[PDB]
């Protein structure tokens, strides 16, 4: 998963 503001 991707950082949250990606």
């Amino acid at each position, epitope marked *: *998963e*991707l*950082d*949250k*503001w*990606a």
Partner: antibody, heavy 123, light 108 residues
């Protein structure tokens, strides 16, 4: 501006639970985006990422420490709590909690850190 | 997860020296990379955020560049207060990862 701080027990025994608290002031967990993470650092070793929790509650842990960590936030106190269970001497380190901005590009870093609290495990 | 290879892992310099340290990412992290300086006994201190942006209040001698998998932190002129350990951290993927750190001591 923003200052954060770690409280908790400096001495903890193998197996038990380590509850850490991040008290901050200069921002709130009501601000959109704002995150608060926990970074630990063993003695003389590198920084290790533990977990992050945001202004609206999504939390992410460390895949390695996932079943042992629980992060929460009390917005009435502006505190973040971290519970790590069944600790062993390898968990001995300095624990830091830091602030992460929110979108206003620069939420790409943890701009202000606690001063750190060094926990030591020893029965 | 995502590996970050800092190098050199240890460095030896003098004041007024110019040194460039890198941080390699196993996967492209765009520009979500931060740099910190850490003096013994003190907590990390943000120098560069978003890979190339100088953090407010940090001396101009520090600078950063890179994108994707290659990143560097340069100190145009080394100061006494710069002999510490430096770390890079990426905030593009979870978990957020730190490099192993680079050490800068006084050369003799």
């Amino acid at each position: 501006r923003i200052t954060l701080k770690e409280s908790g027990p400096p001495l903890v025994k193998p197996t038990q639970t380590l509850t850490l608290t991040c008290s901050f002031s200069g921002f709130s967990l009501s601000d959109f985006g704002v995150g608060v993470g926990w970074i630990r650092q063993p003695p003389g070793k590198a920084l290790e990422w533990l977990a992050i929790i945001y202004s609206d509650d999504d939390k992410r842990y460390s895949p390695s420490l996932n079943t042992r960590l629980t992060i929460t936030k009390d917005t009435s106190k502006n505190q973040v709590v971290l519970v790590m269970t069944r600790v062993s001497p390898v968990d001995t380190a300095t624990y830091f909690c830091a602030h992460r901005r929110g979108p206003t590009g620069p939420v790409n870093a943890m701009d202000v850190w606690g001063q750190g609290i060094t926990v030591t495990i020893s029965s | 997860a995502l590996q970050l290879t800092q190098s050199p892992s240890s460095l030896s310099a003098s004041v007024g020296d110019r040194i460039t340290i890198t941080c390699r990412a196993s996967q492209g992290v765009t520009s979500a990379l931060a740099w910190y300086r850490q003096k013994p006994g003190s907590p990390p201190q943000l120098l560069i955020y978003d890979a190339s942006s100088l953090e407010s209040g940090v001396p101009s001698r520090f600078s950063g560049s890179g994108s994707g998998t290659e990143f560097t932190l340069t100190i145009s002129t080394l100061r006494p207060e710069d002999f510490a350990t430096y770390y890079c951290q990426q905030l593009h993927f979870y978990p957020h990862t730190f490099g192993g750190g680079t050490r800068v001591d006084v050369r003799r």
